[PDB]
Design a protein around this ligand. Structure first.
Ligand SMILES: [Zn+2]
Ligand SMILES: [Zn+2]
Lengths: 141, 287, 190, 275
RNA sequence: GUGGAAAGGCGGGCAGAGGCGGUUUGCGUAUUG
């Protein structure tokens, strides 16, 4: 239960920052780790309604990667500070749950400003939806 | 027996979603994070749109009911309404009962005349269409899918939103238990360009068949267009761009001789107002 | 069980060497359902239909061996006219149409008196080993009688084949191509 | 069975707030224009909840006139987990209890569910009123343009008793005086009973002028004041000729309680000849 | 001197019905530098 939330998180955090770039591995590794990402976010609450502004921000320019623009500067600006605004507006017991979710995406966003636009952000957006999907399967939404 | 062709009255215009418009279709197609009640959006642009089935169906279902009420006196105006009585076939499982709503789709009852000869005189199915075993009267109107106007394309380019997330809740009368939910609806005030083509097949009965289309539209402006609707989510309003006749001599030659009616700043009730003999007067010269 | 061999493997079986079949066949005989609709009541009338559907790179070819002044005078005009009206089938639905390019192609034949035929044989004397075939055509709306051609890959010895003109009640006589296309082969004992 | 249509009684007017209003900490606003607005569900789901509570006390007086009130005793299914039983609030939505009659012919006989609509398992009876959203009025559209603030803010505090620990927050309310424009269309389907539903809808409105509209309400966040403008009828013949053959009912200076009271039967007199 | 010729996979069908952003919490008290 929560004893799995203490061990598996501290097994995964040194593996998290050591692969800080979003183009780490396009093979079976980034999906195998992503289940373990939602495995220590399972024991926390992790409500999605505060993330709905961030995910729709990821949604509205996902079409704009697809022959809309070749610039994800204005979008990825808006994703960085609002995700800091997530603990920047919502604190409390949901803050200790949302600090551990902060430390995975913030190494990957700073790649995406200087990254390719057709590439390396799809490799982020596929890791985006791998965190959400299993989180519905372990019992959270 | 005897299907002819004389032209196509094309009704060009702009549907103005006065209240939040909601249609709704499938979600989660290779996609995880949504609001789980998305209005149908076409995949190439990712913008919402009003379909043709959602407009032809709601123009139909508001014109079964008008006929179902005045079924008694229109048997002289229109034959083959003497096969019918006001009511549903629901209490006894019959595909042809005495009542009006006769055809079972899956579990619901929708009026469709069973034959070509029966539907030729019926006011509903002569316009919107019909079906049967071996007889099969096909439609006359082509209601096409409506997309956003030249202006509202650019408000998606400039950065303005097009869908809003409204939170509604349910409440117990006793314990005040809040039961919330979210809806994706079109932002109120967006504007879609529709087009309704009327295939003129008989010059005997087009005046009493354009008037029926402007009766089903003039009810739709007082009713809602899809969605939750009874709680505000419809309220749609037709803004007519141009009526155009598109005659038979247009299609062979290519001359711009198509008869254009004047519908600049008129309501849908103002076309059917006394003046329908004056708006479509020059169509009588071509017959 | 196989029906076709590759250009590398067709040369080996002429000399009776061990060889290999192809793994995948290029075309796929698929059957598409079509419909027939009356003009007044839009009432359906289904009928099936089936045709050869080729892949993206693939296609069909055939061979020619003879004097080039007969080639460029006759065939190379005809294969540009037949690129715009099809080789049979419902060629008003764009079925038999193609585009043409010509090439040179080399098959080594061992010198012996037996020969496989690369076309329909229609022999004058009885062949050695033959896979039989019955087909008949349609010239200008007139049915042709079923004829006993031999399928491709049967073995004749010194047989030139023939063409049979047919009456069919047309203004001109109508010939049926059955001239053999001999390439040499080594036969076993029988 | 047998859905019909004679016309659509249109109830135009203007909702006035003599005291400041709240919906829901911002009041939700129209995105394309920026203005706050009173929704549809907060005005149809508020009248239903001030009419299912009113019907709950009176199940002896309406049962002689309405069938399918005998099928319920005045009560609640909140302690006892039963769907359709003697208690009057029967549907557990997810966790809330809302009175919905579970059939067509129960809702055809029900006084609530013939008007505010009713779901069901294979019955699904649909409503007879459609309540549209209320934006600002065209004279109050221009105070937004003139900078006269259509909204305001409000700082309360929450006093913990012992340490006198002040715990303030900032409510955001619509300013008192701002006036909207509502819309209720009654779909006249059965000529036998529409005298009821017009005197029965105004019943739910009249309790609302004594109660609150959205927000907290027990602290000042209500005070609807329905300023009616004109009933019209819109007959079936209105949608075929397009004339002005809609019978105007004069209520330019009359109240919700001033229509349901003496003065009713002379106003709706020409509609009764039109049935 | 073509296993050919002619042949619309389509006529009818509103993702619809029901649902309050909600309930409590007094811009205040405590003492001095
Ligand atoms: Zn009919
Ligand atoms: Zn009820």
């Amino acid at each position: 239960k929560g004893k799995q939330w203490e061990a598996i998180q501290p097994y995964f955090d040194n593996v998290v920052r050591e692969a800080k770039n979003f183009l780490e591995w396009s093979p079976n590794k980034r999906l195998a780790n992503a289940v373990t990402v939602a495995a220590y976010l399972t024991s926390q609450g992790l409500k999605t309604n505060q993330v709905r502004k961030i995910l729709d921000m990821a949604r509205t320019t996902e079409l704009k990667v697809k022959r809309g623009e070749g610039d994800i500067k204005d979008d990825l600006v808006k994703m960085r500070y609002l995700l800091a605004y997530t603990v920047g507006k919502a604190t409390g017991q949901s803050k200790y749950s949302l600090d551990a979710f902060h430390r995975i995406l913030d190494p990957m966003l700073e790649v995406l400003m200087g990254s390719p636009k057709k590439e390396n952000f799809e490799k982020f957006y596929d890791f985006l939806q791998a965190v959400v999907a299993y989180h519905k399967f372990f019992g959270g939404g | 027996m005897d299907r002819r062709f004389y032209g196509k009255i094309v009704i060009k215009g702009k549907i103005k979603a006065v209240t939040g418009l909601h249609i709704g279709s499938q979600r989660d197609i290779s996609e995880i994070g949504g609001i789980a009640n998305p209005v149908i959006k076409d995949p190439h642009t990712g913008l919402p749109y009003i379909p043709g089935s959602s407009l032809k169906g709601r123009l139909r279902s508001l014109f079964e009911i008008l006929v179902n009420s005045r079924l008694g006196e229109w048997r002289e105006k229109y034959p083959s309404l003497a096969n019918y009585s006001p009511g549903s076939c629901r209490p006894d499982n019959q595909e042809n009962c005495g009542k009006f709503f006769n055809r079972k789709i899956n579990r619901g009852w929708i009026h469709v005349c069973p034959d070509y000869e029966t539907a030729l005189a019926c006011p509903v199915c002569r316009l919107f269409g019909a079906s049967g075993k071996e007889s099969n009267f096909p439609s006359r109107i082509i209601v096409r899918d409506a997309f956003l106007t030249k202006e509202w394309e650019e408000k998606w380019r400039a950065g303005e939103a097009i869908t809003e997330a409204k939170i509604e809740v349910g409440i117990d009368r006793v314990t005040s238990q809040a039961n919330p939910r979210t809806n994706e609806r079109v932002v109120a005030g967006a504007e879609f360009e529709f087009e309704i083509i009327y295939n003129v097949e008989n010059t005997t009965h087009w005046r009493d068949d354009i008037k029926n289309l402007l009766t089903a539209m003039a009810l739709l402006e007082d009713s809602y267009l899809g969605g939750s609707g009874s709680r505000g989510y419809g309220k749609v309003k037709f803004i007519f761009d141009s009526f155009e006749f598109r005659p038979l001599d247009y299609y062979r030659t290519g001359k711009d001789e198509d008869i254009v009616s004047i519908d600049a700043r008129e309501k849908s009730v103002s076309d059917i107002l006394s003046g329908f003999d004056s708006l479509f007067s020059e169509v009588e010269g071509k017959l | 069980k196989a029906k076709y061999l590759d250009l590398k493997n067709f040369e080996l079986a002429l000399r009776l060497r061990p060889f290999t079949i192809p793994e995948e066949i290029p075309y796929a005989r698929v059957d598409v359902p079509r419909v027939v609709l009356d003009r007044v009541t839009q009432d359906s009338s289904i009928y099936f239909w089936e045709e050869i559907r080729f892949r993206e790179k693939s296609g069909v070819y055939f061979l020619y061996s003879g004097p080039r002044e007969v080639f460029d005078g006759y065939i190379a005009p005809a294969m540009r006219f037949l690129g715009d009206t099809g080789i049979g089938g419902k060629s008003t639905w764009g079925a038999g149409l193609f585009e043409v390019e010509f090439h040179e192609m080399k098959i080594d034949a061992p010198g012996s008196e037996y020969s496989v035929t690369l076309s329909n044989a229609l022999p004058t004397k009885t062949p050695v080993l033959w896979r039989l075939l019955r087909k008949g055509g349609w010239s200008f709306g007139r049915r042709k009688p079923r004829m006993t051609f031999i399928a491709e890959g049967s073995i004749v010895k010194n047989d030139p084949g023939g063409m049979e003109r047919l009456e069919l009640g047309l203004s001109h006589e109508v010939y049926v191509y059955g001239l053999t296309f001999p390439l040499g082969v080594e036969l076993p004992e029988g």
